[PDB]
């Protein structure tokens, strides 16, 4: 994105886009979150991440 977002934002994106463990419903609500505030998308990674791997396999 040349005039959307910024790097910071595209880069968690794609390690949002890259849970293996992750659902629709969360994948949604931060992948939304990001577009929405991309100031606080090293937040939703964290979150995304801390998400994807609380609720991943045993």
Same mark, same amino acid.
């Given at each position: 994105?040349?005039?959307?977002? =910024?790097? !910071? +934002?595209? &880069? %968690? $994106?794609?390690?949002? #886009?890259?849970?293996?463990?992750? =659902?629709? !419903? +969360?994948? &949604? %609500? $931060?992948?939304?979150? #990001?577009?929405?505030?991309?100031?606080?998308?090293?937040?939703?990674? %964290?979150?995304?991440?801390? #998400?994807?791997?609380?609720?991943?396999?045993?």
């Amino acid at each position: 994105v040349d005039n959307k977002f =910024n790097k !910071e +934002q595209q &880069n %968690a $994106f794609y390690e949002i #886009l890259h849970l293996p463990n992750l =659902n629709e !419903e +969360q994948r &949604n %609500a $931060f992948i939304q979150s #990001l577009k929405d505030d991309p100031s606080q998308s090293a937040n939703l990674l %964290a979150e995304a991440k801390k #998400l994807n791997d609380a609720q991943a396999p045993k």
